[PDB]
Design a protein around this ligand. Structure first.
Ligand code: ELV
Ligand code: ELV
Ligand code: MN
Ligand code: MN
Ligand code: MN
Ligand code: MN
Ligand code: MN
Ligand code: MN
Ligand code: NH4
Ligand code: NH4
Ligand code: ZN
Ligand code: ZN
Lengths: 365, 163, 365, 163
DNA sequence: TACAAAATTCCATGACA
DNA sequence: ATTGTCATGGAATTTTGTA
DNA sequence: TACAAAATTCCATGACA
DNA sequence: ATTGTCATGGAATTTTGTA
């Protein structure tokens, strides 16, 4: 319909005159620098674009290059991009090319016992019938308790923590969302004692970073102490715990133990600087030291980061994707931006999920 | 001399026998001499062995310069003696029958005793589970001197469970 | 011995006078800004340093901070660093903090059939009794052949390649060192036909990068074609092969098929630009196109890269490290630097290994 | 008209029956009309089915615009007819008994026949394994016109196995 | 001898277990 | 002997159709 | 108002499956 | 609701002992 006028030589908004628009085989054709191409009617173009794209589900440029072989029309790419936006398959399989924005460096907990980070390591080679270590890191000081367990289970966690909290009770316990800690029994145990449970976003160990980073040290020391010997870790845990609690962080210039106690115990090479102050003068120096510790700033954003905007279309990573299946869930909507690195989404569907950017891609197009 | 500080001396003693809770009969009592902080360890015997296992737990946290104790067979043994030389802990013994400690420690070691009987009658075979509560309770009690809790003297900060 | 003169007040090379060097408890002591420290005799210092280090096998700064508590002497760190160099355990467990230098971008093969890259994908969900796909990528053009197999085995490889090389015989076949290709049977098959086998360095897929990158596309297309359906890949391989061989690389502006043939087949959207040239004029245009393709340059080095120097002490990564065991082999010597990214080492011990930087750390100290 | 190019026409025919090698009896022969490049596919029958399976292999590489063939039952069938319409291949049939091809193709299709008998006598039940060698051989033979090998016309480059 | 916008090129990001 | 690669989609740049 | 070298601080790199 | 962390050992910087 709209193609008659063009052969007539009358101008059409978007069809550059100066190119001769002739007719052959009952199709409208144009002679262009690139060659001679067919101009299809509006009502055919979407069908065309889809056909080309469906050959190997190619993105913008790759799709267009195919189409360009035979056809021309105004703003070809505009139409291509429209299709790629509606291809269910590509949207849920294609990877990202936009990276998460800069991480955050959550303020260090004010006082010890404000916050405990916990996680299980393992399974390890059976020593004495045990397979796992429960690791508990005090957020403020970095002080760490270790407990050997036969399963990464609520039972074991509760048993171990009943010992630990004979010393003091924490305000908050941070954990990942592993079955051990997401169980109702644990919540109840925690409620009985006035402890808030706080959970990492799903599938994101960075959130448990304080405890995770400590797992590395724990493993690395056990490893060194076990070179040449059989892997008999059970008897070493106490030694490791003690060793690591009395190790300086070159950055802080303190051992976790010093930050917890303000004075060394009777260990090798025990610092004696405060030997002359009364416990009181010592206790305030520590209070002062605790507040003036190093605190890391958040790194610069990479060239091509993305940040979450309320009402954005966003896709969550498939947790345990099967072989040959899409690595992403269908699209969801950002409901609240909790911080620039955590959001609430209306997922599949529709439930509220608190989720990390690192487990999200912005739906392209 | 130098002013008294936590970990300078750990006073230790056995309490028991008690009615069996979870097949446990005795409590080993560790009180820090300076702060009055208390640890409680359930044992099956007032033996060197049961002591060593218990104190291995405590000494993954902090090691004292001195342990003081009465001349109980469990503490005078040579196995305990060796254990202490290994960890570089000096052993100090009160003369027999004249069992002296710090003023503050007697006063502390006494509450523990009161507090045990208190929540032991009518709750007799259940005391193993309440040790954590008993422990927390003591460590957060205000000694009229120095108007600080053992918890506060040890950590230099308030508790999230006050009394 | 050497400590008498100091108390006497006579100068010792390396002991800064102005600090009073007194005596207490039968040890020599010095009063320093940091506090009052003990100065131990030469014959004790190594024992001290080792004792401190052995507490948690701490590195330079962390070790020194312990020692500094009780002792002082000239150039403490010098002595610390000496120990850390001789600690078997730390050397083979500690990770690197120096990154490999810039990758290389090996010249694209001149003509097709110069070089084939091959690898197996899988296992995949059993389709038609098959589990693996043999993938064969022509180095020059990127053209890819796909073959379904029941095992990643020499038998299957040989069978498949007997079909492929009915078309043409390649000069070189590049593969990883998987049992399938390192077998003598394969070498023999290859020798019978005058094909050079060339192997990637051990445990380094970057070397097979051309074929590996192609595996990604293969998997990603199968995936999209399988959304909603059961994973019946066997019947799709031909379609996938065809699809991908006729897909433009937005960078090259050509499909593998175009680069192999200089003219499209009878496929959807087949380019018609050369329709007017005789096959001959067409064949030279292609020869010209093949030589003038994009070629990626090697990226800038990161701040803290390291490069291999003949006779350097160097450590190879443990292949399949057990739980709690060291992640590195003992030290070895660089024998030849093949390119700035590949070396020959005298390993464990002593055999000649051709090895990648990425699987090496420079022995610190 | 436009100058003749590879993939414009694929001439196909059956050779056989032959003595059984690996339980195979026939060879399907595909020659490209312009270059003279040859594909050989062993089949168990001169049937539409055996053809389709074979040509599915070949058409993962390249698809011709036209397939030309004699009026063998295997090619005239409607199943083959549909197969070809699917892939957008036009079907062209030589009149019965007057089976014409390109000049170059007859000459090619003839060597194949000579070459088969040649390495078929004395090697009779072993010919399945030699197809690859036979194939390579043909594709790298110099047709006196245009003094190029089929391999060279198709790929625009020399071979790593010349003859 | 210059404009807005389309068309092209750039290119970090991530995945080949 | 041996060696990373390249589709993707926003952004940055270049070219285009019209003065 | 200054030098070489030791001592300290900086900080990219990698590992917590 | 929730959020990355920090030992390590060369290099870059600052301080030190002596003029
Ligand atoms: C890094 O972990 C990998 C190990 C891989 C592969 C891939 C990856 C991830 C990766 C994949 C592809 C390309 C790149 Cl450059 C890349 F980084 C293989 O693809 C592969 C094969 O047999 O093909 C064998 N391995 C083995 C594992 O047991 C070893 C070589 C570690
Ligand atoms: C990225 O792969 C990982 C997955 C991890 C963990 C660790 C890593 C690697 C990693 C480890 C530690 C810290 C950081 Cl910062 C980090 F990046 C855990 O440590 C963990 C747990 O239960 O503790 C559970 N996962 C599960 C896996 O099934 C999911 C959270 C994917
Ligand atoms: Mn966990
Ligand atoms: Mn973990
Ligand atoms: Mn007693
Ligand atoms: Mn492989
Ligand atoms: Mn692979
Ligand atoms: Mn016939
Ligand atoms: N925070
Ligand atoms: N190269
Ligand atoms: Zn698609
Ligand atoms: Zn070490």
């Amino acid at each position: 319909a709209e193609l008659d006028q063009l052969l007539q030589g009358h101008y059409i908004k978007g069809y550059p005159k100066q190119y001769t628009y002739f007719l052959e085989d009952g199709k409208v054709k144009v002679s262009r620098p690139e060659g001679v191409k067919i101009i299809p009617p509006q009502s055919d173009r979407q069908k065309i674009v889809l056909q080309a794209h469906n050959l190997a589900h190619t993105g913008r440029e790759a799709t267009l290059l195919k189409i360009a072989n035979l056809y021309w029309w105004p703003n070809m790419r505009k139409d291509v991009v429209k299709q790629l936006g509606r291809c269910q398959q590509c949207l849920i399989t294609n990877a990202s090319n936009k990276a998460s924005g800069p991480i955050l460096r959550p303020d260090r907990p004010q006082k010890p016992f404000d916050k405990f980070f916990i996680d299980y390591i393992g399974p390890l080679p059976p020593s004495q019938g045990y397979l796992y270590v429960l690791v508990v890191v005090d957020g403020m000081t970095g002080f760490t308790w270790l407990y050997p367990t036969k399963a990464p289970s609520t039972s074991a966690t509760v048993k171990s923590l009943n010992v630990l909290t004979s010393i003091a009770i924490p305000k908050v316990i941070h954990s990942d969302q592993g079955a051990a800690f997401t169980s109702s029994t644990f919540a109840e145990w925690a409620k009985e004692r006035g402890i808030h449970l706080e959970f990492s976003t799903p599938y994101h160990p960075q959130s448990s970073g304080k405890v995770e980073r400590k797992n590395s040290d724990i493993k690395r020391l056990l490893t060194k102490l076990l070179v040449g010997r059989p892997t008999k870790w059970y008897d070493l845990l106490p030694v490791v715990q003690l060793a690591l609690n009395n190790t300086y962080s070159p950055v802080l210039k303190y051992t976790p133990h010093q930050l917890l106690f303000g004075i060394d115990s009777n260990t090798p090479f025990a610092n004696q600087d405060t030997l002359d102050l009364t416990r009181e003068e010592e206790l305030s120096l520590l209070q002062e030291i605790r507040t003036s510790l190093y605190h890391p700033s958040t790194p610069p954003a990479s060239s091509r980061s993305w940040s979450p905007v309320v009402g954005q279309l966003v896709q969550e990573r498939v947790a345990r994707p099967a072989s040959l299946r899409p690595r992403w869930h269908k699209p969801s909507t950002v409901l609240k931006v909790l911080n620039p690195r955590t959001v609430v989404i209306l997922d599949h569907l529709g439930n509220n999920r608190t989720v990390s950017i690192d487990n999200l891609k912005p739906t392209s197009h | 001399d130098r002013p008294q500080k936590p970990f300078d001396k750990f006073f230790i003693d056995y309490i028991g026998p008690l009615p069996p809770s979870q097949g446990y009969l005795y409590v080993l009592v560790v009180v820090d001499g300076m702060t009055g902080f208390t640890w409680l360890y359930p044992t099956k015997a007032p033996s060197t062995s049961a002591t060593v296992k218990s104190l291995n737990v405590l000494t993954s946290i902090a090691i004292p310069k001195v342990i003081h104790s009465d001349q109980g067979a469990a503490f005078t043994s040579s196995t305990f003696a060796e254990w202490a030389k290994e960890r570089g802990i000096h052993l100090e013994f009160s003369t027999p029958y004249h069992p002296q400690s710090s003023g503050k420690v007697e006063r502390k070691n006494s509450d523990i005793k009161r507090l045990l009987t208190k929540l032991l009658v009518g709750r007799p075979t259940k005391w193993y589970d309440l040790l954590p509560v008993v422990q927390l309770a003591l460590n957060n009690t205000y000694s009229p001197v120095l108007k600080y809790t053992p918890h506060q003297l040890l950590f230099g900060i308030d508790s999230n469970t006050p009394f």
